Amino acid sequence: RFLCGVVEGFYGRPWVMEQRKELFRRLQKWELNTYLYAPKDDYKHRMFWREMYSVEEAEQLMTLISAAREYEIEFIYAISPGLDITFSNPKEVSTLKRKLDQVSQFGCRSFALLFDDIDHNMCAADKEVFSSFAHAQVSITNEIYQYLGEPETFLFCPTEYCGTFCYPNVSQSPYLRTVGEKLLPGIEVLWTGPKVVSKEIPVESIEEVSKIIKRAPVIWDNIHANDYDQKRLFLGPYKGRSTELIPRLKGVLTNPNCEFEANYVAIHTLATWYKSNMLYSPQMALKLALTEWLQEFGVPHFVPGPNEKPLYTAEPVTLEDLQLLADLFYLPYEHGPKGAQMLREFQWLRANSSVKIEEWRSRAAKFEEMCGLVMGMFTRLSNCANRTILYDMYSYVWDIKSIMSMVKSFVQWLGCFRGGLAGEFQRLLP
Amino acid sequence: RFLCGVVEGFYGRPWVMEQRKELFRRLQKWELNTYLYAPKDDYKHRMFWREMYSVEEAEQLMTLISAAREYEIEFIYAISPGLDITFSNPKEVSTLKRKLDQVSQFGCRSFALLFDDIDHNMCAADKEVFSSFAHAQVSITNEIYQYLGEPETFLFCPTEYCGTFCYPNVSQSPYLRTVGEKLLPGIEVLWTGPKVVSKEIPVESIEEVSKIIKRAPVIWDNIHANDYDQKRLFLGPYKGRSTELIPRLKGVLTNPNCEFEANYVAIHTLATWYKSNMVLYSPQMALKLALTEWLQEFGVPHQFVPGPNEKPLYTAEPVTLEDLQLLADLFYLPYEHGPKGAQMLREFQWLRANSSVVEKIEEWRSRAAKFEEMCGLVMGMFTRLSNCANRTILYDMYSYVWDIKSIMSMVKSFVQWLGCEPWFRGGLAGEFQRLL
Ligand SMILES: CC(=O)N[C@H]1CN2/C(=N/Cc3ccccc3)SC[C@@H]2[C@@H](O)[C@@H]1O
Ligand SMILES: CC(=O)N[C@H]1CN2/C(=N/Cc3ccccc3)SC[C@@H]2[C@@H](O)[C@@H]1O
């Protein structure tokens, strides 16, 4: 009973109901099975966790939950009361149960209590009735598991959800020790890897955590999350997670890009990786993902003479175009092959600038040609028929086209306020 | 007859019909009078200028154009054919004519043709039939003006639509000379001033262009546009345009931020500037007037009281005027940070340079702490924005305020460290940008 799919768990503009339904369509298609509802800035999920859904909100959640049954996706409703709750106060515990009862009434079987990204300092009144912070969470958590009659699927995200976040370390964490002991064994535990956005989730780290968690954890994977850096998109494939981890985990839910339509690769290649050992090749999973993704660009959501201006809209998006895009907007820790290369070629064309000086002039002329592929990719994308995809990635495609059209003017100049205030500070740090 | 209002004229996700109706309501409330429709990447405005509106698209346009009439806002439909039209071919001219006649039947009485951000190089058949790019544009433009019955308002936007873009200068541009000579006299010409994004629009610069084009232009103002730089947002006031320009202009249409709800200040301050001259206009007082009005929208969607022993309500403190004054100073104008933003940059420039002395080590200890306080007001500003009841405004600004909150907290912990991986910020674009 392995939970594998998508947590809508990021900061900023949540997905709307139309997009979530369509995500169910895509999860079923690729043979994944779980959706965790946890959008940090959907007001009633965290900031106003006490507030009851209105009739209109109730109706849209009922329809969305129905839509998840219709596509054989398990809908897990998460709630985040960490910022605000007095755990010792029973009227608070009552408020949380009322909120979770309304959601069961919408036809929701599965649930989650998240405690991630809050400070570990309790109030005077919780300090009295509870030993440590973990104790207070485990109490509230278990009592809710039980009140809801021990559902099959009931997740718990600890405040210490990655390696780095464990004080003083993983295996001697007194917050985590208490989670493995006092928290009921039917409740599952969420974990992001060594770090918040793990580069790798190695098997050593999962055995280690399991030992003190005293369970196989559900992985909350932030590998493709772009909520933390305005300029960054992640179109690269699932990587740094081995097929070997599947038997050591109760599940893997990926928290991908804020822009819905850019999670084709992230959610596709994750399915390639799950099929693999229910072995896995990143560079092949991606070509598989990109080839199918290319299908959507041509579906919405004169034949000029030899003396006449040719059609600007003539050329359509091509698997090469998309392959470049993905290399430009790859992963949180490596650029794609063509990306890291364009970069190197620029570093050297800048250093060895030479006022056998021919190795340069017909080497930075292969660059003026490769900078024109970035420009070509934007122009064809700006003309594609699926405007929904374009709009979702417009800001990012424009940005990289702009920096490469300025890097071009430069690496062809050597032969003859950008970012606002945030930028001016950035350019004065490390 | 002065056209003052908004042009939806920018690259990227256009506004949806609900937002446009909301715009007309705001324009009327602030006593502005014009909307120019020209979204670079709305489907059938530019790339697919030729295709006619579906029956569904036609219903939406008609509802929008009636909404404009109901709100006493002039609706100007613009089209951008110059990427791939052939100007000599009377079938291409007939397609353009068809497109505009369709919109005319939707209720539209005002039109525009735009020839901006296309390359200068014509093709063979056009080169044969027309003397210059200007000759071709003036030709099909004058035709269309006359076909639609010489409507009271019809705009032209040149390929050479600012100073930097005129070859080889404004005064001696043969392109603009052709436009001023040939282009019919009842058509108005749009101008972005000395630059695409003009810091100032000096009156001298309006008399210069007015001569080579032989009329008072209509400004297309890109002062608050933010399509060109992913990290930028402009919440500062209308600034750098004398009220002396008004009597020397046919109008001002501002092309503001992509994010609809970030344009309260941009549009509100333009209104104040316009209305001040129908020292008349202070940007700073315009800005306070706008943020004061804007603040009221924040606590409106688009009980347990804890004891002294218990955890207080995270969501308790609502957005203040001082929070919005800080936000605007952080995201001000294209060529100027606001006072608090410049100040915060100055005290950090200095704490970094005079770092050694950690005597004058009595000063630095004070300064670094007053700086930690200010970084604190940026975090507090984020926290209260993310709790506000208007999730629509929050969503449009989220990524901007998240970013300045996260950079100020990096900077704050660098200044703390000097007194002693979410956290390669920018991706690939980043690393290329750091070599220029
Ligand atoms: C349980 C979990 O993954 N929660 C978060 C983690 N995270 C972030 N957290 C905030 C943070 C900022 C700076 C440094 C560390 C942590 S940002 C990316 C992701 C965000 O999508 C996600 O909901
Ligand atoms: C008449 C007019 O303003 N047209 C355009 C100009 N412009 C831009 N031009 C593209 C450009 C990119 C790079 C360098 C120079 C120019 S971006 C801002 C604005 C954009 O909103 C607007 O539609």
Swiss-Prot record, chain A:
Disulfide bonds: none annotated. Proteolytically cleaved by caspase-3 during apoptosis. The fragments interact with each other; cleavage does not decrease enzyme activity. Ubiquitous. Shows highest expression in the brain, placenta and pancreas. Coiled coil: none annotated. Changing Y11 to K/Q: Strongly reduces affinity for glycopeptide substrates. Nearly abolishes enzyme activity. Changing D117N: Nearly abolishes enzyme activity. Changing D117A: Nearly abolishes enzyme activity. A protein binds at G9, K40, D116, D117, Y161, D227, N255. Changing V197 to G/T: Nearly abolishes enzyme activity. It comes from the Eukaryota. Changing Y228S: Nearly abolishes enzyme activity. The active site is at D117 (proton donor). Residues 2-278 form the GH84 domain. Belongs to the glycosyl hydrolase 84 family. Monomer. Interacts with CLOCK. This is Protein O-GlcNAcase.
